[PDB]
């Protein structure tokens with residue numbers, strides 16, 4: 556259970572479907588998936604304090620949290636939400652998100668390290684689950 560490393564993608568699933576539920580319309584979804592279905596992820600872990608950097612070609616997102624401590628970040632479609640992370644096993648954590656403003660689909664994410672050394676990220680919007688699978692560089 557050391558999440559730390561520089562992670563690269565081997566697999567991704569249902570990302571466009573996720574964006575549809577989030578209300579991103581067609582041309583935008585098609586364009587987006589043709590250059591954001593290969594983001595890089597960097598994690599530095601310090602106990603249950605996490606630093607996560609997620610980057611495409613021209614955009615980067617910085618997430619900082621302690622497990623069990625409320626913080627702020629964005630939904631996938633760039634919307635301000637309150638977040639809370641909890642452990643579900645030794646190698647898996649879960650985040651529940653609430654919008655600061657307005658209404659929208661219920662969103663969440665999970666992070667899991669397999670024993671094979673795969674980092675599995677899921678993002679969920681109502682009934683849709685998008686899964687990204689990473690290995691270490």
Ligand SMILES: *C/C=C(C)/C=C/C=C(C)/C=C/C1=C(C)CCCC1(C)C
Nearest residue numbers: 591594607609630631632664666676
């Ligand atoms: C523990 C790992 C976490 C919290 C990683 C979360 C990653 C995302 C929320 C990625 C979001 C993306 C966008 C917001 C737009 C570009 C496509 C993604 C998947 C990189």
